[PDB]
Amino acid sequence: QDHFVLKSGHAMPAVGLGTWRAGSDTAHSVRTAITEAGYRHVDTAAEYGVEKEVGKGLKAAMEAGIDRKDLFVTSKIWCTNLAPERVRPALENTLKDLQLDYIDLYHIHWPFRLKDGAHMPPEAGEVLEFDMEGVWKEMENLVKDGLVKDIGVCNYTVTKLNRLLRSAKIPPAVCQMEMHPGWKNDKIFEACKKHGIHITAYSPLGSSEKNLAHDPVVEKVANKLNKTPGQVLIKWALQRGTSVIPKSSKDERIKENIQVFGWEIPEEDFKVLCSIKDEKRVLTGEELFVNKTHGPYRSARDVWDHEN
Numbered sequence: 001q002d003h004f005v006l007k008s009g010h011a012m013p014a015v016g017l018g019t020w021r022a023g024s025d026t027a028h029s030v031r032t033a034i035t036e037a038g039y040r041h042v043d044t045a046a047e048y049g050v051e052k053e054v055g056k057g058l059k060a061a062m063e064a065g066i067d068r069k070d071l072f073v074t075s076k077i078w079c080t081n082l083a084p085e086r087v088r089p090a091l092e093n094t095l096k097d098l099q100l101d102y103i104d105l106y107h108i109h110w111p112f113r114l115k116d117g118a119h120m121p122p123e124a125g126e127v128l129e130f131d132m133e134g135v136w137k138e139m140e141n142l143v144k145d146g147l148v149k150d151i152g153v154c155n156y157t158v159t160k161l162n163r164l165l166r167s168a169k170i171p172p173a174v175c176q177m178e179m180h181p182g183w184k185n186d187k188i189f190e191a192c193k194k195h196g197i198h199i200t201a202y203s204p205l206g207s208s209e210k211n212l213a214h215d216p217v218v219e220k221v222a223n224k225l226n227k228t229p230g231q232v233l234i235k236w237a238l239q240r241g242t243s244v245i246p247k248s249s250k251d252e253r254i255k256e257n258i259q260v261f262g263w264e265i266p267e268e269d270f271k272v273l274c275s276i277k278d279e280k281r282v283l284t285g286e287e288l289f290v291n292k293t294h295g296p297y298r299s300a301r302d303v304w305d306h307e308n
């Protein structure tokens with residue numbers, strides 16, 4: 001399927017353009033992706049520092065004839081704004097930068113609150129308690145006021161998900177998580193499926209740090225299908241039933257990355273990719289939330305509630 005239907009009934013395109021670390025060509029990339037390559041989904045975040053440029057690209061694409069109703073824009077609220085009174089201001093700032101009246105999906109970027117001016121790695125006292133229930137209530141008010149069509153979360157665990165579901169009046173529409181061969185996170189995927197929550201795979205190519213385009217296992221599959229390794233990695237996500245948001249700042253790759261319809265990865269090869277051991281995680285959150293000397297999180301396991 002080229003799109004997924006969220007619980008709210010809103011459709012979400014299966015493939016989107018990631019914009020993290022997109023650089024100076026951000027605006028150009030977004031316009032090219034949408035017009036030339038047919039993308040109808042863009043994923044960004046306030047913390048990426050590129051939303052003003054993404055807004056310029058979206059504006060140019062709309063000026064080119066694409067209607068706002070046909071575009072799906074996702075953004076995320078950063079840790080420093082995860083306090084009830086800070087939710088609305090953070091979202092309004094994001095709409096201003098993006099030049100939009102509303103966004104289609106707004107995610108909790110990480111389920112941890114950071115003090116203003118927090119450093120990487122965090123100092124003592126800088127990682128604060130996340131009032132999940134109170135913050136989520138203000139996220140729901142964004143939907144009530146038509147500023148956001150759907151709300152979701154990123155980087156969750158099953159324990160955090162169950163806590164959210166006991167409180168939420170509007171359940172998260174989407175759970176966005178790092179997923180690729182070598183880091184399937186089947187555990188969170190199964191909890192989301194159990195509750196009818198759609199899942200979006202981020203860093204589908206293993207990001208740049210653990211990029212899989214040159215992995216021999218992926219190359220072997222790609223050569224037999226006459227597809228590029230990136231296309232095989234993106235198609236693997238769609239075959240698992242998740243949306244997927246590959247990032248490239250290169251027009252050629254932006255086009256390459258969406259040529260993933262009209263063919264499939266044979267089951268035997270899909271299984272080989274699934275067999276790659278889960279240990280290749282790119283984003284552990286250690287540089288953002290771990291201070292082993294003072295806590296509150298002393299290791300990556302503490303960040304993930306000892307679930308992986």
Ligand SMILES: NC(=O)C1=CN([C@@H]2O[C@H](COP(=O)(O)OP(=O)(O)OC[C@H]3O[C@@H](n4cnc5c(N)ncnc54)[C@H](OP(=O)(O)O)[C@@H]3O)[C@@H](O)[C@H]2O)C=CC1
Pocket residue numbers: 017018019020021043044109154155176201202203204205206207208211213228229230231245246247248249250253256257283
């Ligand atoms: N919620 C969260 O915490 C997170 C969300 N995300 C979202 O997910 C998106 C995608 O993840 P991201 O980590 O950026 O990385 P990807 O897994 O999409 O990998 C991007 C890297 O792959 C290269 N690349 C892109 N296309 C190809 C290709 N066809 N063949 C070979 N190399 C290729 C890129 O280089 P180049 O640009 O030079 O082409 C870049 O180095 C992000 O941009 C962001 O929108 C990401 C991390 C965390």
